[PDB]
């Protein structure tokens, strides 16, 4: 079977170098170039360029020229997209394929996510958050947490060991000073609490911070 | 009285900015960005390779 696997999410900062690995199966390695597409941070998908495999010949894409490479390596057939002089911009979704030359490809590469920031590893600031009285409307209270500041991802929010998933909604992350913030809520009726507890359990293994925070009366 | 301008001739020249793209075997043409504008000199050729 052909299933193109990636190095996966990779953590880099301004400066440095990267070789992103893509390893392939199903098929024999020097007989598909690898086509090579950057999915922008705008989740626009930028074509970086195509390596000739046999001959080992990489075909950039002008915009992507001279601080990026395509290397390969035959005998375990894994593909290597090098990167130089990492820059904030480049954070980003890259993507391998197996080609079928001008209709491309029939198999899509798992994917690598690379993040070039400047921060310290830290454990998120979870925080339980107490609804007002303009904050219970329809007989639900509404309750919350905070996740503030962490790096890097992922966390794993839930309420009660994931107990309780109905009004759950674990909203993303974005950037403050190369730190993530996101918040989740969960939704239970107004007569399960204060009355039965509802702890937020955010799990930070890049961290290795598991935090429990129960929303307590005003 | 009057001399029109016929034309005029560069005898003197000097290099500036070489720039040559390399390209793998079984290519076929090799083609550098520089060949749209007029004043960069741009020829054909090839490399030995390894």
């Known amino acids: 079977q052909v299933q193109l696997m990636e190095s996966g999410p990779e953590l880099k900062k301004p400066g440095e170098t990267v070789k992103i690995s893509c390893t392939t199966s199903?098929?024999?390695?020097?007989?598909?170039?690898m086509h090579w597409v950057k999915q922008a941070p705008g989740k626009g998908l930028e074509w970086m360029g195509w390596?000739?495999?046999?001959?080992?010949?990489?075909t950039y894409a002008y915009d992507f020229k001279e601080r990026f490479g395509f290397s390969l390596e035959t005998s375990a057939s894994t593909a290597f997209l090098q990167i130089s002089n990492l820059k904030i911009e480049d954070t980003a979704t890259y993507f391998c394929?197996?080609?079928?030359?001008?209709?491309?490809?029939?198999?899509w590469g798992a994917g690598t996510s690379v993040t070039v920031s400047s921060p310290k590893t830290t454990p998120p600031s979870v925080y339980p958050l107490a609804p007002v009285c303009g904050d219970t409307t329809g007989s639900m209270v509404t309750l919350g947490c905070l996740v503030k500041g962490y790096f890097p991802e992922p966390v794993t929010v839930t309420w009660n060991s994931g107990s309780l998933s109905s009004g759950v909604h674990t909203f993303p992350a974005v950037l403050q000073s190369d730190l993530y913030t996101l918040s989740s809520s969960v939704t239970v009726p107004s007569s399960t609490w204060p009355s039965e507890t509802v702890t937020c359990n955010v799990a930070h293994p890049a961290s290795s911070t598991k935090v429990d925070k129960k929303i307590v009366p005003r | 009285s009057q001399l029109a301008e016929v034309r005029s001739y560069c005898y003197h020249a000097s290099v500036t900015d070489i720039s040559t793209v390399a390209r793998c075997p079984m290519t076929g043409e090799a083609h550098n960005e520089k060949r749209a504008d007029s004043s960069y000199v741009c020829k054909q050729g090839f490399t030995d390779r390894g």
């Open positions: 394929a197996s080609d079928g030359r001008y209709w491309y490809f029939g198999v």
């Open positions: 199903g098929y024999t390695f020097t007989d598909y170039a």
């Open positions: 390596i000739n495999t046999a001959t080992g010949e990489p």
